[PDB]
Amino acid sequence: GSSGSSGVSSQETQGGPLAPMTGTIEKVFVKAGDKVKAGDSLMVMIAMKMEHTIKSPKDGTVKKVFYREGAQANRHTPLVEFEEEESDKRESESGPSSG
C-alpha cells in the first residue's frame, strides 16, 4: 500500500505501523530511540484470543511508542512512530503523452 489512497484530507498515516484489528497489547518489544529491523517483532496484540505479532513494516529508529502492556488499540491505529527519515530519495519516471 503506497502511492495514492483516495478519500483523505491530508495523510491518514505516516511513519509508523497500524494495528490490524481491535485488540490488546500483550507484549511490547520496542521503545523510543530504539533500533529495529524490517520484519521485527515490535509488540504483541490480543484480539481473537490469538497472539498477533505486529511486525515492523520497515526499519528505523523508534521515535516513541503510544502503547504498552495491557493497552487497548483500535483497528488502524498508530502503535509506534518512526524517527524522521534521512538520506533517501525515491525514484520516478515520466514519458510523453499523445493526447
Give the N-terminus to C-terminus distance in angstroms. Answer: 29 Å
How many strands appear in the DSSP assignment? 7
Q: How do the strands of the widest beta sheet line up side by side? A: 4-3-1-6
Q: Helicity level, as a percent range?
A: under 10%
CATH class of the domain at 17-84: Mainly Beta
Helix-strand makeup class? mainly beta
Report the β-strand fraction as a percent range: 25-35%
Biggest sheet, open or closed, and with what strands and sense?
A: 4 strands, antiparallel
DSSP summary: helix tally: 0
Compressed to H and E, one letter per element, the order equals: EEEEEEE
How would you describe this protein?
This protein starts with 22 loop residues before the first strand and ends in a 17-residue tail after the last strand. It is mostly beta strands and 99 residues long. The protein is built from no helices and 7 strands. The chain has a domain at 17-84: RNA polymerase II/Efflux pump adaptor protein, barrel-sandwich hybrid domain (OB fold (Dihydrolipoamide Acetyltransferase, E2P)). Helix content is 0%, strand content 32%. Biotin-attachment subunit of the 3-methylcrotonyl-CoA carboxylase, an enzyme that catalyzes the conversion of 3-methylcrotonyl-CoA to 3-methylglutaconyl-CoA, a critical step for leucine and isovaleric acid catabolism. It is found in: Mitochondrion matrix.
